[PDB]
Write an enzyme that holds these catalytic residues in place. Structure first.
Site: not given
Ligand SMILES: [Cl-]
Ligand SMILES: [Mg+2]
Ligand SMILES: [Mg+2]
Ligand code: NA
Ligand code: NA
Lengths: 152, 135, 156, 135
Positions: D1, D29, D52-53, D55
């Site tokens: 990301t 996904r 970001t992370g 999701g």
């Protein structure tokens, strides 16, 4: 404890008896949902079943009676969210799943994911025993006519 | 689009949205319906919402979560939040449609800025109300 | 308020006890060059929307970052890319998800925002919309890097 | 990301997010990155955010718009909203990651709850700052 449902908003022309098909539909589905709530069924099961019934009902733009894309195909979208866990499941752009809201629920329940799209969404569903259907099953005269009318 | 929102005897909220989308959409187009906080949202702390309408505006306005956020942060009632979102903010962006909302205390709202919204609601152990046109 | 840019190339357990200083400096020079390009645009009166599009285009191109070139692999050893851009001025937004044949998803997202009535497009539909607007089709393998493939094998 | 947020000399906010997703991801996904108000949001009235992370959590918590709604309705500062979202609400839901945010007043924030976040920022006409780890 309480349920609300909708079958879409817009430019709603009509006789009483035409209007009453929509009213009896809405009434039967909200009542099914009312009975489940009274019987101690979960909010999540109640909104899944109501939307499943609204999908099945060809009067409403969801599952059977879906609008048409420009290519005269169906591409369906659904979401369900549990306000307890804040878990959600969602599918978008699916053409081979009879009940997108059931697909959504499956994504919520039997993946760690919130949203799945397209053939990925479908293959995930098929892999967990959800049946494949041909997009033609959602097709109705009324939505096709609206497609022709949208062209001009 | 269709939708359901419910509050259960355990005091849990849920929401669901399903749709064919917009007539004559480009293949691959996604509206608000599958987008958490756009067309569908549920949080026991606030509200369960399901939306119907101009999906692009519902996404840009994050209609469903904005009801939740106006109630939870803005201290609005469901009615105030629904009015603000459906009658002011969505029209302000040229969004037409409505939504159904139940808050954690079982207040129910069915706002729409369109001519009609196919809708019903009913408290468990009560007779349901149905509607198409305004009021 | 006074003009400014921030960028990221992802959050995670980036650990010092795996990265060398030389590896870390490549990431620092990458970040530095891109934020500086975005800084020059802002100083020159370029729009926030053009500046975030270019910065993310540069982050996509850079194979150090899990976006465009250097994207991770799916379970099927494919790439599936997603982007969003939003204009705070108009509140317009454009987004693609599930795209494998568009070199710069953030450019596709911009295209959805600027040259459709839609906010989000997915998959082959997203791609066909982009091709029909003259965006170039690319091989999915252009995003493929040795680094990300190895990470796939290590995950499995 | 990856992400970008900007505030321009016209006082306009914008945000962008791009990603290849998760290594070994299940095909089809979608995480927060393409989802308005999950991984990407911008509103001249509030903030530009890119996330970001993990999701799934960024979607469930609508992290990007939640910063906007906490500031706009909750009266939080960017700093407060960033702490609340990244350090409290996202961990609360088992969400790891961070985000970059600039508000209408030119405040910049780069919160993360992870070991690292590849990041940079700079005021127009100033020296930029880069970062990887905490401190
Ligand atoms: Cl009526
Ligand atoms: Mg410019
Ligand atoms: Mg690669
Ligand atoms: Na139907
Ligand atoms: Na890259």
């Amino acid at each position: 404890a309480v349920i609300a449902i909708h079958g879409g908003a817009g430019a709603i022309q009509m006789s009483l008896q035409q209007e009453l098909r929509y009213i009896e539909a809405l009434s039967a589905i909200v009542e099914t949902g009312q009975k489940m709530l009274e019987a101690g069924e979960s909010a999540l099961d109640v909104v899944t079943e109501a939307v499943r019934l609204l999908e099945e009902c060809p009067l409403f733009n969801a599952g059977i009676g879906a609008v048409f894309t420009r290519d005269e195909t169906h591409e369906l979208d659904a979401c369900v969210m549990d306000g307890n866990t804040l878990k959600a499941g969602a599918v978008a752009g699916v053409s081979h799943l009879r009940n997108p809201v059931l697909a959504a629920r499956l994504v919520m329940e039997q993946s760690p994911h919130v949203m799945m799209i397209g053939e990925g969404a479908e293959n995930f569903a098929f892999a967990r025993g959800m049946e494949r259907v041909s997009p033609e099953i959602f097709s109705t005269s009324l939505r096709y006519e609206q497609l022709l009318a949208a062209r001009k | 689009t269709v939708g359901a929102v419910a509050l259960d005897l355990d005091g849990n909220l849920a929401a669901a949205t399903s749709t064919g989308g917009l007539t004559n959409k480009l293949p691959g187009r996604v509206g608000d319906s599958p987008l958490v906080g756009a067309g569908c949202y549920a949080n026991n702390a606030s509200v369960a919402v399901s939306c119907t309408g101009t999906g692009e505006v519902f996404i840009r306005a994050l209609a469903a979560y904005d009801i939740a956020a106006l109630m939870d942060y803005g201290g609005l009632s469901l009615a105030e939040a629904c009015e603000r979102v459906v009658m002011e903010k969505l029209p302000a962006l040229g969004g037409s449609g409505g939504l159904i909302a139940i808050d954690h205390e079982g207040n129910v709202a069915l706002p729409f800025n369109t001519e009609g919204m196919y809708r019903a609601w009913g408290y468990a152990g009560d007779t349901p109300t149905t509607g198409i046109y305004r009021e």
